[PDB]
């Protein structure tokens, strides 16, 4: 799943 | 210094899918262990219809998004949350509400 950051 | 078992705002180990229910409004927040990156920290936000997920960065000893690093993470989500500071630059999150345990 997708993190804004990293 | 304070623990992070003893914030309200801090979730432990629960899902990203369980943290979906809990976060509705502009500027709703909480922290909790990572599953997709075991070990890291996050902190999850509602902003602008969607909820977000920042992994909050552990590097050479300090806690940090994109700015100042802190020793540990309530100083840092504390600072956030007083003055107001946004998360990032490219998201421009400003948290308010911080979601209870």
């Known amino acids: 799943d997708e993190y804004e950051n990293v | 210094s304070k623990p ?3 914030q309200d705002w801090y979730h432990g180990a629960i899902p990203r899918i ?7 409004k502009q500027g709703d927040f909480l922290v ?6 075991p070990g ?4 999850s936000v509602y ?6 997920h920042f992994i909050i960065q552990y590097v050479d000893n300090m806690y940090r998004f994109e700015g100042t690093g802190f ?3 309530p100083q840092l989500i504390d600072h956030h949350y007083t003055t ?4 990032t630059k490219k998201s421009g999150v ?3 509400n911080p979601i209870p345990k």
């Open chain 2, 40 to 43: 890291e920290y996050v902190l």
């Open chain 2, 32 to 37: 909790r262990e990572s599953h997709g990156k």
């Open chain 2, 94 to 96: 400003v948290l308010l």
């Open chain 2, 18 to 24: 369980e943290a979906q229910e809990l976060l509705k």
């Open chain 2, 84 to 87: 107001k500071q946004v998360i």
């Open chain 2, 47 to 52: 902003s602008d219809g969607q909820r977000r």
């Open chain 2, 71 to 73: 020793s540990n993470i």
């Open chain 2, 4 to 6: 992070l078992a003893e």
